[PDB]
Amino acid sequence: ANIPEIENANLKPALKDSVLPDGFYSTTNHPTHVKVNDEWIEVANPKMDAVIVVYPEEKRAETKVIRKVKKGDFVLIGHNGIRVMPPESEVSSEKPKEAIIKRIAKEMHEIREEYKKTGTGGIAIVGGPAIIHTGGGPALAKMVELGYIQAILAGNALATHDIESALYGTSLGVNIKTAKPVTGGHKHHIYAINAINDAGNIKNAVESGVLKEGIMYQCIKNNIPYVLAGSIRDDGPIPDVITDSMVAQDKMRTTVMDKKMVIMLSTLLHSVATGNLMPSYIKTVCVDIQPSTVTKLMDRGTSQAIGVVTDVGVFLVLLLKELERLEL
Amino acid sequence: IENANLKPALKDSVLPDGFYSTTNHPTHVKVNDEWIEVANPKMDAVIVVYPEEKRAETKVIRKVKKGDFVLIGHNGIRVMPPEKSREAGQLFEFMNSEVSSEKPKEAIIKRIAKEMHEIREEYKKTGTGGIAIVGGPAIIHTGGGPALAKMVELGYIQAILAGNALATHDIESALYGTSLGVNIKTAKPVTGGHKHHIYAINAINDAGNIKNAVESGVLKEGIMYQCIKNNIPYVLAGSIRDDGPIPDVITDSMVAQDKMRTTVMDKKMVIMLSTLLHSVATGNLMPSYIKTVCVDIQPSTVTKLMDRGTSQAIGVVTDVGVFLVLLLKELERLEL
Amino acid sequence: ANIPEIENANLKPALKDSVLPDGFYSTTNHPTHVKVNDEWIEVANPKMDAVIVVYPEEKRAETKVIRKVKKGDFVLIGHNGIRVMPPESEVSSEKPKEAIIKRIAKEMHEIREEYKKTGTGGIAIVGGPAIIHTGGGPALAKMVELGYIQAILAGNALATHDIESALYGTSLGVNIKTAKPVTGGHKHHIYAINAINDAGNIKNAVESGVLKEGIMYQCIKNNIPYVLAGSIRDDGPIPDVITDSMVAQDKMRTTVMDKKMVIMLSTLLHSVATGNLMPSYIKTVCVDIQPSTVTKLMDRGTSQAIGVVTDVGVFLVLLLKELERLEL
Amino acid sequence: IENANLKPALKDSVLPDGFYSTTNHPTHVKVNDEWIEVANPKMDAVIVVYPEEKRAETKVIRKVKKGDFVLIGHNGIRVMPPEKSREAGQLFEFMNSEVSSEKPKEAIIKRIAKEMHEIREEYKKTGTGGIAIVGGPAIIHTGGGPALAKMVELGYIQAILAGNALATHDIESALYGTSLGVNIKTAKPVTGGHKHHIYAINAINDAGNIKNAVESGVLKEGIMYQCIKNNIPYVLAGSIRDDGPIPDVITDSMVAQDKMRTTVMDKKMVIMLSTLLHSVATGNLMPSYIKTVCVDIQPSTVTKLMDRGTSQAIGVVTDVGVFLVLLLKELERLEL
Ligand code: NI
Numbered sequence A, C: 001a002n003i004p005e006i007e008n009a010n011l012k013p014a015l016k017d018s019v020l021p022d023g024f025y026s027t028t029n030h031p032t033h034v035k036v037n038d039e040w041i042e043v044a045n046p047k048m049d050a051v052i053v054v055y056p057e058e059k060r061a062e063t064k065v066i067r068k069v070k071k072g073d074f075v076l077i078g079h080n081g082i083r084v085m086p087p088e089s090e091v092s093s094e095k096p097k098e099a100i101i102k103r104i105a106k107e108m109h110e111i112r113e114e115y116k117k118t119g120t121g122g123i124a125i126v127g128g129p130a131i132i133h134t135g136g137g138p139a140l141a142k143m144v145e146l147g148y149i150q151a152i153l154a155g156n157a158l159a160t161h162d163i164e165s166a167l168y169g170t171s172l173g174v175n176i177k178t179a180k181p182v183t184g185g186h187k188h189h190i191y192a193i194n195a196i197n198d199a200g201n202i203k204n205a206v207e208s209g210v211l212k213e214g215i216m217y218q219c220i221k222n223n224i225p226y227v228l229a230g231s232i233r234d235d236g237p238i239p240d241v242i243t244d245s246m247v248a249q250d251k252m253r254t255t256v257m258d259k260k261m262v263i264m265l266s267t268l269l270h271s272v273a274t275g276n277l278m279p280s281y282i283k284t285v286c287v288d289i290q291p292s293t294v295t296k297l298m299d300r301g302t303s304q305a306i307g308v309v310t311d312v313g314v315f316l317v318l319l320l321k322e323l324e325r326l327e328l
Numbered sequence B, D: 001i002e003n004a005n006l007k008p009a010l011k012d013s014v015l016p017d018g019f020y021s022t023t024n025h026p027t028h029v030k031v032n033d034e035w036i037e038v039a040n041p042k043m044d045a046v047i048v049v050y051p052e053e054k055r056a057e058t059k060v061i062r063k064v065k066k067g068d069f070v071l072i073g074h075n076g077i078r079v080m081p082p083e084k085s086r087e088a089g090q091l092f093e094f095m096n097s098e099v100s101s102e103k104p105k106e107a108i109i110k111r112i113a114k115e116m117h118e119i120r121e122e123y124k125k126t127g128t129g130g131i132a133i134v135g136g137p138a139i140i141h142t143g144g145g146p147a148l149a150k151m152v153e154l155g156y157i158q159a160i161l162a163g164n165a166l167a168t169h170d171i172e173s174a175l176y177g178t179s180l181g182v183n184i185k186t187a188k189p190v191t192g193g194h195k196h197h198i199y200a201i202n203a204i205n206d207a208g209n210i211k212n213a214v215e216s217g218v219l220k221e222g223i224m225y226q227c228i229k230n231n232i233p234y235v236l237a238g239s240i241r242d243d244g245p246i247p248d249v250i251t252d253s254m255v256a257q258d259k260m261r262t263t264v265m266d267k268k269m270v271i272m273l274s275t276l277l278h279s280v281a282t283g284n285l286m287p288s289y290i291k292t293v294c295v296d297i298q299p300s301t302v303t304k305l306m307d308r309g310t311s312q313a314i315g316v317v318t319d320v321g322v323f324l325v326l327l328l329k330e331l332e333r334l335e336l
């Protein structure tokens, strides 16, 4: 009897770097197992939109995106010996928001407690500069200070305007505490970049007392790693920024892979980029003011994902109050 | 300065050629060599002069009567728009859009709360001015209802203009704990919740009106309840979407419009919460000197409002339900 | 044996005008039948969110919304003798638009042909003033002229700015052909209202040659009925406008009930109001630039409904070109 | 007028205190009592002066070298923003938002097409200026690809700046008739269409680059094809969302940025089509004198662009796929 599920997988060597052989299997985001020489191999690093490369003599297998496939790599093809292991809703802003924020706070508190007990898991934030423009920067910094955040994935703008807020009270020249523009404020963000360039990097700015508050400050003080991916729209960038997209992508992937939850705060491109890198067993909270953006995040979803159509500015402020309440 | 040109209306609701069509700004007219202050500034209307009474008023075209003296052309008029800032703007600056969600929210909530506190203080002193709310049912759907009801309870609110949907979902949540069958406290749909909205309308129809439902103990909490208890007037305008308007609803749009105008025109501030229809309808009725705040999650709503003449509006592009919860906390902070 | 489906329906008299008895049946938008004194009655005027009132001695039944229920009316309650007869997709702007417009044009052409042969059916438009502001007014007027449109449901603003365009070339003072504002143009729409008030109504304005082009003109010339529902935001209004919402609602309901298709063009409140009045057997095309608006229209849908997230201005222009192509 | 103050950079990418941070406008600096025109106007950058060469240029901070003389403060500078209109605006007017979908679309399409026709004529005469397109993959998803490819074919387009997604979906539609597995001609998903996108990337990887795929007969139609055939340069910037960038993609954002800057800075017009990332990235690199048109279905996209300094942008809030189809028809009308 031929039963594809328990037949040995078929493999084909890639004929060129980054060229997938005909019949290649496209991965889900689910933990996958492949049968090779009569033994089930657990495929490392689950990720959607990739192929599986097999190392039969090492009895190992890993997920590889196309750009990392090398000539000679044995790519899984066909339909035999593939076992997928999945882990065990209309988008609208018109849903009770205090309620969902309270429920999110409860979940974060439970995740943080388990991280404290075990030292693994925890929460990554994917953040864009709207967090700062909407006045949500201090709330997010306080979450980092309270131990809720185990990593931040962002880019030059979030870091720059968070630092501009610290140094000058403004984001793109708008005063955070009053929402009024400051005369000549257009230069403030370039002055912030210059200040970090002079310090050498963010760590130096913090350790030397140039930078004394805010998200990046809290990350340095609490040893929270962050990844700042460079973008074609960047001013500067600051020294910490990884300018090559593919390098930044690799670093993002390794940063999120062991988290229990990723919270995506209003940045479609960074949030999609991050979701693309996540296995299905990570919980996702997707937050944006545009329903179409949230929808695009709810489309490539992990098995546990919620979308909240709301303004990150007020969302972060109320969320922090709910977290502060739980601290008591 | 020439005296204004005046010509009598030849028939009800028909105006002489060259008639002046008003801005939303206070306007004065020169009549028998004196400046007369035109009563009730409001855009897209006409100025009717009563020279023998030394008065003039802003009348909508459908209220103009045969023989009314209508201001013609632009001579002998003085229009007073809001004060321009003391200095020209900067050459180069960022984030200066009139309408965008990318603006510091805690800052603007603090500022709005300080102004509402000041305005409530003055209303308590004078018995005049005060604040009107214009609201849509998203206030309820997003969990903002309790916060707004509390502001009414605390004396911040002197009028509410809304429709059947706001009132009936507020009442749904008071009777059943849901809006659209979704539980306000948990954000989860409840079994049979799809019926709560019609049950709420049925209950008010049975009672006879909102006031009767409060008097009978049927309605015990919420925005409309607090209006009854605190004698805060409301105007509920009927709309073509209503299959079950409650008895309080004014089904004729012009009767509703006229009542809305007299309700808002003496307020110090109008806060518009998640309603395109009512934001624009109310702005169309308001003079430019009333502080106007338009809160919605859709920037296109605030832009539509400003595009239709309400250029004094301060837009806050944000989630109304979270905004109301935070605003209340800030008002409570100030009161302490 | 008791088989609810074929048991005689239970009825209860309403105890007060507009008060539904406990247990009332809430209607679908589907053709419904009720069993009364051992005979199946076909319920007139299917409509969702209503009750069914029965006249046993007349062997008839109709759908009544709550506001029309009268003391003594026998309202259908309970679970016996109710037979519903239904007639025999993710919302996104990122879908091939020329393609869907071509398909819509084909469908309209087939519907118009059948209306021409039979004299019944055809197409109603639900329209708001954005049709005029976006420069789509001439395209819609040409559809009326070509015989595609059997009714228009709108309000004071669409009519006012269509007439302002005819008389002065502007909508709210913006020139339609150049998109430039005209100095002093803010008065133009009130002048348009005044011009119709002087003529007496739209029909008089057309018959007297005051109004010589545009949507309202084409409706008068081609005997297309329209319903203009008054709104609290109205300037004027013009004489044709029905200022009472409930009267306007009744007139809208009777206008749409015999149509084969309703096309809803960017007006959330009018489009929802209209959808609420339609039986399930009418085809719907829902068009708006906001995904959340289209979603709200796709929620209360007839059994055949499509949503198109697009700008009505360019949509109408391209749609007309496709219809003009079919004319040849 | 004082001569400008200059101070040398103390280290690479570190500027002296008080350094001038540029606008997006042409700027002149007074050096040894002569006005020098600062090369390559671009915002959020610095002005480096070479007094002995009687020249100055706008350098981004990361290209500033130890010892470069950097303009300090605001003396001895002359900034030339776009010409202001001959008269102040009206007191009271409607629909004057910078960004709204409620504006006459046929009118603006006609105007854009006339300008593109004029600009193409001048480019054919001079070999300089011309038009760049900045585009996102929604061009393809909405059925606008064929229209844009035709504009390239007809000589309207001198450069394309985009990402992997635009190029690879264009190529998907050329090879398979789909974008995201949805058939362009029918708007229906096709069986197995979810694979077409990776098949298209695989095909280009196999060929070696886009040019090779065209030369081999693999790629026979579409935007990238027309760029190859007509020798129109493109810049495809890599992004962190790319798991399969094709070989043409520049993965380093600063290398991509520098190439984009030199590509756009000599154009007469830049048309940005459905891309927040590239609209803002390109606007950040552009002087204010280049005609800038930003087309998107989301008004917040155009507002974000203008909020970040590109205040010369003309926003067209519309469906890009329908817009491109209509624009092409108007260009074809003018050519006849
Ligand atoms: Ni889930």
Ligand code: NI
Pocket (backbone or CB within 6 Å): C303, C304, C305, C306
């Ligand atoms: Ni259907």
